[PDB]
Design a binder for these strands. Sequence first.
RNA 1: ACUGAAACUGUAGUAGAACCAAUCGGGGUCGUCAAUA
Length: 114
Amino acid sequence: GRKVYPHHKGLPNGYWSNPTEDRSQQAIQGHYQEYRRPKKDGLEQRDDQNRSVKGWVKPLTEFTFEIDVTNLSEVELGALLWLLTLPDLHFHRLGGGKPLGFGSVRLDIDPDKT
RNA sequence: ACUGAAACUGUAGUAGAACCAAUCGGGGUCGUCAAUA
């Protein structure tokens, strides 16, 4: 079917904090810092198998955008608004590094602007 | 068995009307590899 990257539920507090620290060789609440390359012999494994990011967009930062739609049926609109009004703790998966846990996002309609 | 003369092919008329250079596409992501003895 369609490949999807399920939301990384239950990541511990501080899992994403201070990411330049190699914590991957140590359990914290049972998680192992999957998003970071491990050290090898104490030096960073920057090679052609992975990439580096100079930064990322922090958790809890907010974006607004608009969707303009034309001639949607109620079924087509219902599917869209269903995706835009999912129950709590349902998250979309956006951008790169999704299998590392990056890019889980909360989408909800702003009704006053709709 | 005495050359006619003299007379601007000019005058008026917009190569133009209409037509979206555009449609679709997350800068993304995980299992080996190799063939003999």
